[PDB]
Amino acid sequence: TDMALALNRYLCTAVLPLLLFAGTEHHASLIDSLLHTVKGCSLTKAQRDSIEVCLLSPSMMQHLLRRLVFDVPLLNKMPLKLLTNHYERCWKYYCLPGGASEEELHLSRKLFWGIFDALYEQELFKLALPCLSAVAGALPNFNPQPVDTSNITIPEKLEYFINKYAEHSHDKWSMDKLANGWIYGEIYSDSSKVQPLMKPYKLLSEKEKEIYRWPIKESLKTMLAWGWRIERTREGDAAHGYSPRAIDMSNVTLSRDLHAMAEMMAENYHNIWAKKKKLELESKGGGNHPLLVPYDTLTAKEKAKDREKAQDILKFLQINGYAVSRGYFLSAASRPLCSGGHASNKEKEMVFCKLGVLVRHRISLFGNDATLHILGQTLDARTVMKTGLESVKFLDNAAEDLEKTMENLKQGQFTTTVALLPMLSSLFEHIGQHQFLEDVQVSCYRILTSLYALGVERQRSALGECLAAFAGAAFLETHLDKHNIYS
């Protein structure tokens, strides 16, 4: 407490020093200062020390534009909502000069807009949904999840592999040190450069293989843990003492199957060593260690024994020739899934989720101002809501008509069976409540003139009589929506 009053006063004194490799600690450590409050009112000044510290950096800030994206999925309080969505629009600046992670940006877009069905509160989620059109327009907590390795037994085909890879290991323990060539003695006198461990491989015993054997078996058993395995293909490949005719595993190029598994093997090693660090010094009276931060931020220099050691276990597999196997693109490839995913979210506009009608539809307007396959299904997307909430065309979704064609204004002005009958089906659902309500006819006028900016035969004399029905029904302001579509 009495030294925990340091944080209270320094919410301004560590701010005024506001006015690219070793600065990664503040994107890791100081990101967790406000995360302790994610001092009460004074924590809002920590946003000014962070939401402005990201934009004018962008080397490690390129790895911090989606920093809390490993915890923005675990947002929901109010500071967990503003730790991402307020820095969402500023996350296009890092990939502005740089425009492996373009599919990870949709993880907090296809779920947080679905978590927008769980909640004023959407004052920060609305413009950040258009920042997802900017994070894909400029380029184009986090708990470790441990898995236990030794549950399975060593397969017999990879026992000719644990004796060849360990035989190469004592070469690789010397190929990094062959310019000096260190040898065994009896006493560890490192002033005269002798090691007590430099013994050859062909004179090994039943309890000294385990220095070589155990890094391989924690690197082989964890391949079978994700529904993946190893298949078969064709075959392939001074001084004196233990002098080998060896080859290096820092110049052999890899396969494309192995990339998503070996970078997951470091993610596997981000869930073993990030748990093996919790079993060494914390039970003796230790303190708080910062390695529980989000995933794309923290230092990787300890992981050089985990990112460069999780590839040569399977670079050596390509020596043996074994078939390692895995069995704005995503904003466009899932866009027909999105127009079918928002229309499936159009049925719940009648029965929190009524804000989901406005959090999903009105945010794709700039996405339609930046881009009939998905647009012809989006013309009838609100025709599921104006049929499901057809009695009221249900709290906010009964009066979401003024924002309904507002996303179809930018979609209609930005462009023969996918538009023939259904162009005047949802449009008449706006002009059908024109003189019941005037928030539907004010958007139907921009729906009837949504073709004069892009250039309804059947709906020409149904609205022309409706112009002759609402000529004085003010519904004369609703007459300009039914008189602009009668020829």
PDB file of C-alpha atoms in Angstrom, residues 146-334:
ATOM      1  CA  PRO A 146      -0.714 -26.028 -21.307  1.00  0.00           C
ATOM      2  CA  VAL A 147      -0.581 -29.468 -22.900  1.00  0.00           C
ATOM      3  CA  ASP A 148       1.190 -32.478 -21.392  1.00  0.00           C
ATOM      4  CA  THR A 149       3.663 -34.242 -23.669  1.00  0.00           C
ATOM      5  CA  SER A 150       4.517 -37.669 -22.199  1.00  0.00           C
ATOM      6  CA  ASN A 151       0.936 -39.057 -22.307  1.00  0.00           C
ATOM      7  CA  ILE A 152       1.617 -41.094 -25.449  1.00  0.00           C
ATOM      8  CA  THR A 153       4.418 -43.616 -25.910  1.00  0.00           C
ATOM      9  CA  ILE A 154       7.321 -43.202 -28.381  1.00  0.00           C
ATOM     10  CA  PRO A 155       6.323 -44.695 -31.762  1.00  0.00           C
ATOM     11  CA  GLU A 156       8.614 -47.387 -33.116  1.00  0.00           C
ATOM     12  CA  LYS A 157       9.286 -45.732 -36.483  1.00  0.00           C
ATOM     13  CA  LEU A 158      10.565 -42.626 -34.658  1.00  0.00           C
ATOM     14  CA  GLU A 159      13.026 -44.719 -32.626  1.00  0.00           C
ATOM     15  CA  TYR A 160      15.305 -44.894 -35.660  1.00  0.00           C
ATOM     16  CA  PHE A 161      14.756 -41.110 -35.595  1.00  0.00           C
ATOM     17  CA  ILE A 162      15.657 -40.536 -31.925  1.00  0.00           C
ATOM     18  CA  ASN A 163      19.019 -42.262 -32.518  1.00  0.00           C
ATOM     19  CA  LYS A 164      19.865 -40.405 -35.757  1.00  0.00           C
ATOM     20  CA  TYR A 165      18.802 -36.954 -34.516  1.00  0.00           C
ATOM     21  CA  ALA A 166      20.704 -37.392 -31.245  1.00  0.00           C
ATOM     22  CA  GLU A 167      23.716 -38.580 -33.264  1.00  0.00           C
ATOM     23  CA  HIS A 168      23.433 -35.330 -35.223  1.00  0.00           C
ATOM     24  CA  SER A 169      22.986 -33.408 -31.952  1.00  0.00           C
ATOM     25  CA  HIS A 170      26.566 -33.939 -30.760  1.00  0.00           C
ATOM     26  CA  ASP A 171      27.650 -32.728 -34.182  1.00  0.00           C
ATOM     27  CA  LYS A 172      25.344 -29.705 -33.776  1.00  0.00           C
ATOM     28  CA  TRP A 173      26.782 -29.168 -30.288  1.00  0.00           C
ATOM     29  CA  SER A 174      30.156 -29.049 -32.078  1.00  0.00           C
ATOM     30  CA  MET A 175      29.223 -27.442 -35.424  1.00  0.00           C
ATOM     31  CA  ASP A 176      28.550 -24.219 -33.492  1.00  0.00           C
ATOM     32  CA  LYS A 177      31.908 -24.662 -31.709  1.00  0.00           C
ATOM     33  CA  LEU A 178      34.147 -26.362 -34.335  1.00  0.00           C
ATOM     34  CA  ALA A 179      36.445 -23.325 -34.656  1.00  0.00           C
ATOM     35  CA  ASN A 180      37.688 -24.069 -31.114  1.00  0.00           C
ATOM     36  CA  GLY A 181      36.752 -27.745 -30.694  1.00  0.00           C
ATOM     37  CA  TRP A 182      36.106 -28.164 -26.969  1.00  0.00           C
ATOM     38  CA  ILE A 183      37.046 -31.458 -25.323  1.00  0.00           C
ATOM     39  CA  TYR A 184      36.458 -33.310 -22.049  1.00  0.00           C
ATOM     40  CA  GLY A 185      38.819 -33.123 -19.077  1.00  0.00           C
ATOM     41  CA  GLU A 186      38.268 -33.885 -15.402  1.00  0.00           C
ATOM     42  CA  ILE A 187      38.022 -30.481 -13.657  1.00  0.00           C
ATOM     43  CA  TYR A 188      35.801 -27.564 -14.735  1.00  0.00           C
ATOM     44  CA  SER A 189      38.548 -24.933 -15.103  1.00  0.00           C
ATOM     45  CA  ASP A 190      36.891 -22.509 -17.526  1.00  0.00           C
ATOM     46  CA  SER A 191      39.829 -20.089 -17.259  1.00  0.00           C
ATOM     47  CA  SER A 192      41.748 -22.619 -19.399  1.00  0.00           C
ATOM     48  CA  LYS A 193      38.679 -23.447 -21.558  1.00  0.00           C
ATOM     49  CA  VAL A 194      37.778 -27.040 -20.667  1.00  0.00           C
ATOM     50  CA  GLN A 195      34.265 -28.496 -20.318  1.00  0.00           C
ATOM     51  CA  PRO A 196      33.092 -31.445 -18.178  1.00  0.00           C
ATOM     52  CA  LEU A 197      30.495 -32.452 -20.774  1.00  0.00           C
ATOM     53  CA  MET A 198      32.353 -32.826 -24.105  1.00  0.00           C
ATOM     54  CA  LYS A 199      32.147 -36.612 -24.536  1.00  0.00           C
ATOM     55  CA  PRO A 200      31.466 -38.357 -27.912  1.00  0.00           C
ATOM     56  CA  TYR A 201      28.239 -40.108 -28.948  1.00  0.00           C
ATOM     57  CA  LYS A 202      29.465 -43.625 -29.830  1.00  0.00           C
ATOM     58  CA  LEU A 203      30.501 -44.311 -26.204  1.00  0.00           C
ATOM     59  CA  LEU A 204      27.099 -43.566 -24.666  1.00  0.00           C
ATOM     60  CA  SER A 205      25.429 -45.384 -21.777  1.00  0.00           C
ATOM     61  CA  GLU A 206      21.846 -46.151 -20.739  1.00  0.00           C
ATOM     62  CA  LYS A 207      21.561 -43.087 -18.463  1.00  0.00           C
ATOM     63  CA  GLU A 208      23.607 -40.488 -20.391  1.00  0.00           C
ATOM     64  CA  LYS A 209      21.489 -40.541 -23.545  1.00  0.00           C
ATOM     65  CA  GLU A 210      18.847 -38.679 -21.480  1.00  0.00           C
ATOM     66  CA  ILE A 211      20.611 -35.319 -21.901  1.00  0.00           C
ATOM     67  CA  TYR A 212      20.177 -35.761 -25.656  1.00  0.00           C
ATOM     68  CA  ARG A 213      17.069 -37.968 -25.485  1.00  0.00           C
ATOM     69  CA  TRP A 214      14.702 -35.741 -23.497  1.00  0.00           C
ATOM     70  CA  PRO A 215      14.681 -32.641 -25.808  1.00  0.00           C
ATOM     71  CA  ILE A 216      13.634 -34.947 -28.668  1.00  0.00           C
ATOM     72  CA  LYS A 217      10.813 -36.751 -26.839  1.00  0.00           C
ATOM     73  CA  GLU A 218       9.281 -33.449 -25.716  1.00  0.00           C
ATOM     74  CA  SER A 219       9.523 -32.494 -29.412  1.00  0.00           C
ATOM     75  CA  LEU A 220       8.048 -35.690 -30.930  1.00  0.00           C
ATOM     76  CA  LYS A 221       5.124 -36.634 -28.659  1.00  0.00           C
ATOM     77  CA  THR A 222       3.536 -33.199 -29.135  1.00  0.00           C
ATOM     78  CA  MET A 223       3.022 -33.734 -32.869  1.00  0.00           C
ATOM     79  CA  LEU A 224       0.231 -36.257 -32.219  1.00  0.00           C
ATOM     80  CA  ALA A 225      -1.619 -33.891 -29.856  1.00  0.00           C
ATOM     81  CA  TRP A 226      -3.472 -31.791 -32.486  1.00  0.00           C
ATOM     82  CA  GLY A 227      -4.769 -34.552 -34.753  1.00  0.00           C
ATOM     83  CA  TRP A 228      -1.592 -34.467 -36.868  1.00  0.00           C
ATOM     84  CA  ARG A 229       1.158 -37.030 -37.504  1.00  0.00           C
ATOM     85  CA  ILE A 230       4.013 -38.007 -39.848  1.00  0.00           C
ATOM     86  CA  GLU A 231       3.535 -39.933 -43.130  1.00  0.00           C
ATOM     87  CA  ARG A 232       5.897 -41.590 -45.628  1.00  0.00           C
ATOM     88  CA  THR A 233       7.477 -40.723 -48.983  1.00  0.00           C
ATOM     89  CA  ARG A 234      10.642 -41.697 -50.885  1.00  0.00           C
ATOM     90  CA  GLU A 235      14.126 -41.862 -49.364  1.00  0.00           C
ATOM     91  CA  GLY A 236      16.835 -39.215 -49.186  1.00  0.00           C
ATOM     92  CA  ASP A 237      19.329 -37.438 -46.971  1.00  0.00           C
ATOM     93  CA  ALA A 238      41.467 -29.524 -38.921  1.00  0.00           C
ATOM     94  CA  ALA A 239      41.837 -31.950 -35.994  1.00  0.00           C
ATOM     95  CA  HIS A 240      40.937 -35.524 -35.012  1.00  0.00           C
ATOM     96  CA  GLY A 241      38.691 -37.339 -32.534  1.00  0.00           C
ATOM     97  CA  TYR A 242      34.919 -37.072 -32.865  1.00  0.00           C
ATOM     98  CA  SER A 243      35.306 -35.363 -36.238  1.00  0.00           C
ATOM     99  CA  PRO A 244      32.099 -35.784 -38.282  1.00  0.00           C
ATOM    100  CA  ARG A 245      31.167 -35.310 -41.924  1.00  0.00           C
ATOM    101  CA  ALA A 246      28.051 -33.434 -40.847  1.00  0.00           C
ATOM    102  CA  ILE A 247      25.721 -30.876 -42.422  1.00  0.00           C
ATOM    103  CA  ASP A 248      23.968 -27.878 -40.940  1.00  0.00           C
ATOM    104  CA  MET A 249      20.256 -27.361 -40.261  1.00  0.00           C
ATOM    105  CA  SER A 250      20.436 -23.589 -40.763  1.00  0.00           C
ATOM    106  CA  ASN A 251      20.517 -23.720 -44.583  1.00  0.00           C
ATOM    107  CA  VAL A 252      17.932 -26.398 -45.539  1.00  0.00           C
ATOM    108  CA  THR A 253      14.636 -24.922 -46.730  1.00  0.00           C
ATOM    109  CA  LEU A 254      11.405 -26.293 -45.288  1.00  0.00           C
ATOM    110  CA  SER A 255       7.990 -27.501 -46.567  1.00  0.00           C
ATOM    111  CA  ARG A 256       4.743 -25.556 -46.538  1.00  0.00           C
ATOM    112  CA  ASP A 257       2.905 -28.117 -44.387  1.00  0.00           C
ATOM    113  CA  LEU A 258       5.426 -27.749 -41.596  1.00  0.00           C
ATOM    114  CA  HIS A 259       5.025 -23.962 -41.166  1.00  0.00           C
ATOM    115  CA  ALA A 260       1.647 -23.975 -39.417  1.00  0.00           C
ATOM    116  CA  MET A 261       2.766 -26.814 -37.110  1.00  0.00           C
ATOM    117  CA  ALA A 262       6.268 -25.602 -36.184  1.00  0.00           C
ATOM    118  CA  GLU A 263       5.071 -22.070 -35.467  1.00  0.00           C
ATOM    119  CA  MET A 264       2.446 -23.856 -33.376  1.00  0.00           C
ATOM    120  CA  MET A 265       5.291 -25.886 -31.848  1.00  0.00           C
ATOM    121  CA  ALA A 266       6.709 -22.608 -30.580  1.00  0.00           C
ATOM    122  CA  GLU A 267       3.120 -21.895 -29.505  1.00  0.00           C
ATOM    123  CA  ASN A 268       3.273 -25.334 -27.906  1.00  0.00           C
ATOM    124  CA  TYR A 269       6.547 -24.170 -26.357  1.00  0.00           C
ATOM    125  CA  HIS A 270       4.718 -20.951 -25.450  1.00  0.00           C
ATOM    126  CA  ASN A 271       2.485 -23.253 -23.376  1.00  0.00           C
ATOM    127  CA  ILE A 272       5.200 -25.447 -21.810  1.00  0.00           C
ATOM    128  CA  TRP A 273       8.106 -23.105 -21.027  1.00  0.00           C
ATOM    129  CA  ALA A 274       5.619 -20.368 -20.121  1.00  0.00           C
ATOM    130  CA  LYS A 275       4.361 -22.929 -17.599  1.00  0.00           C
ATOM    131  CA  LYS A 276       7.802 -24.418 -16.807  1.00  0.00           C
ATOM    132  CA  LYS A 277       8.868 -20.930 -15.722  1.00  0.00           C
ATOM    133  CA  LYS A 278       6.079 -21.146 -13.112  1.00  0.00           C
ATOM    134  CA  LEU A 279       7.580 -24.270 -11.490  1.00  0.00           C
ATOM    135  CA  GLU A 280      11.101 -23.050 -10.667  1.00  0.00           C
ATOM    136  CA  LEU A 281      11.238 -19.927  -8.457  1.00  0.00           C
ATOM    137  CA  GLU A 282       7.652 -19.098  -7.418  1.00  0.00           C
ATOM    138  CA  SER A 283       7.187 -21.641  -4.601  1.00  0.00           C
ATOM    139  CA  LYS A 284      10.076 -20.271  -2.508  1.00  0.00           C
ATOM    140  CA  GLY A 285       8.610 -16.799  -1.905  1.00  0.00           C
ATOM    141  CA  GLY A 286       8.990 -15.295  -5.353  1.00  0.00           C
ATOM    142  CA  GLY A 287       7.277 -12.367  -7.000  1.00  0.00           C
ATOM    143  CA  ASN A 288       5.158 -11.447 -10.010  1.00  0.00           C
ATOM    144  CA  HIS A 289       6.753 -12.360 -13.372  1.00  0.00           C
ATOM    145  CA  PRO A 290       5.426 -10.587 -16.480  1.00  0.00           C
ATOM    146  CA  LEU A 291       5.191 -13.447 -18.995  1.00  0.00           C
ATOM    147  CA  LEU A 292       1.349 -13.649 -18.801  1.00  0.00           C
ATOM    148  CA  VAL A 293       0.953 -10.678 -21.213  1.00  0.00           C
ATOM    149  CA  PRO A 294      -0.768 -11.064 -24.632  1.00  0.00           C
ATOM    150  CA  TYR A 295       0.855 -13.198 -27.249  1.00  0.00           C
ATOM    151  CA  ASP A 296       2.185 -10.885 -29.982  1.00  0.00           C
ATOM    152  CA  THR A 297       4.039  -8.461 -27.701  1.00  0.00           C
ATOM    153  CA  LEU A 298       6.624 -10.028 -25.393  1.00  0.00           C
ATOM    154  CA  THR A 299      10.330 -10.638 -26.037  1.00  0.00           C
ATOM    155  CA  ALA A 300      11.437 -13.693 -28.017  1.00  0.00           C
ATOM    156  CA  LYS A 301      15.101 -13.929 -26.967  1.00  0.00           C
ATOM    157  CA  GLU A 302      14.281 -16.728 -24.524  1.00  0.00           C
ATOM    158  CA  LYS A 303      12.165 -18.161 -27.354  1.00  0.00           C
ATOM    159  CA  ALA A 304      15.252 -18.413 -29.579  1.00  0.00           C
ATOM    160  CA  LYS A 305      15.714 -21.717 -27.743  1.00  0.00           C
ATOM    161  CA  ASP A 306      12.018 -22.369 -28.550  1.00  0.00           C
ATOM    162  CA  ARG A 307      11.412 -20.882 -32.033  1.00  0.00           C
ATOM    163  CA  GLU A 308      14.726 -22.004 -33.545  1.00  0.00           C
ATOM    164  CA  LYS A 309      14.679 -25.316 -31.636  1.00  0.00           C
ATOM    165  CA  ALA A 310      11.159 -26.279 -32.805  1.00  0.00           C
ATOM    166  CA  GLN A 311      12.069 -26.282 -36.523  1.00  0.00           C
ATOM    167  CA  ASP A 312      15.307 -28.305 -36.638  1.00  0.00           C
ATOM    168  CA  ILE A 313      13.361 -31.146 -35.005  1.00  0.00           C
ATOM    169  CA  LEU A 314      11.461 -31.251 -38.307  1.00  0.00           C
ATOM    170  CA  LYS A 315      14.097 -29.810 -40.627  1.00  0.00           C
ATOM    171  CA  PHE A 316      15.833 -33.101 -39.844  1.00  0.00           C
ATOM    172  CA  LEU A 317      12.573 -34.869 -40.728  1.00  0.00           C
ATOM    173  CA  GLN A 318      12.946 -33.601 -44.305  1.00  0.00           C
ATOM    174  CA  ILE A 319      16.351 -35.310 -44.426  1.00  0.00           C
ATOM    175  CA  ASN A 320      14.555 -38.634 -43.963  1.00  0.00           C
ATOM    176  CA  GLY A 321      11.929 -37.609 -46.525  1.00  0.00           C
ATOM    177  CA  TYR A 322       8.789 -38.229 -44.472  1.00  0.00           C
ATOM    178  CA  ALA A 323       5.466 -36.664 -45.472  1.00  0.00           C
ATOM    179  CA  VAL A 324       4.761 -34.050 -42.835  1.00  0.00           C
ATOM    180  CA  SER A 325       1.219 -32.836 -43.547  1.00  0.00           C
ATOM    181  CA  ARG A 326      -1.585 -30.795 -42.014  1.00  0.00           C
ATOM    182  CA  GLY A 327      -4.526 -33.005 -43.018  1.00  0.00           C
ATOM    183  CA  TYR A 328      -8.737  -8.293 -47.460  1.00  0.00           C
ATOM    184  CA  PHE A 329      -9.102 -11.898 -48.600  1.00  0.00           C
ATOM    185  CA  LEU A 330     -10.885 -13.226 -45.505  1.00  0.00           C
ATOM    186  CA  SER A 331     -12.956 -10.033 -45.436  1.00  0.00           C
ATOM    187  CA  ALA A 332     -14.031 -11.018 -48.970  1.00  0.00           C
ATOM    188  CA  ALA A 333     -14.002 -14.833 -48.810  1.00  0.00           C
ATOM    189  CA  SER A 334     -16.223 -14.805 -45.718  1.00  0.00           C
TER     190      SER A 334
END
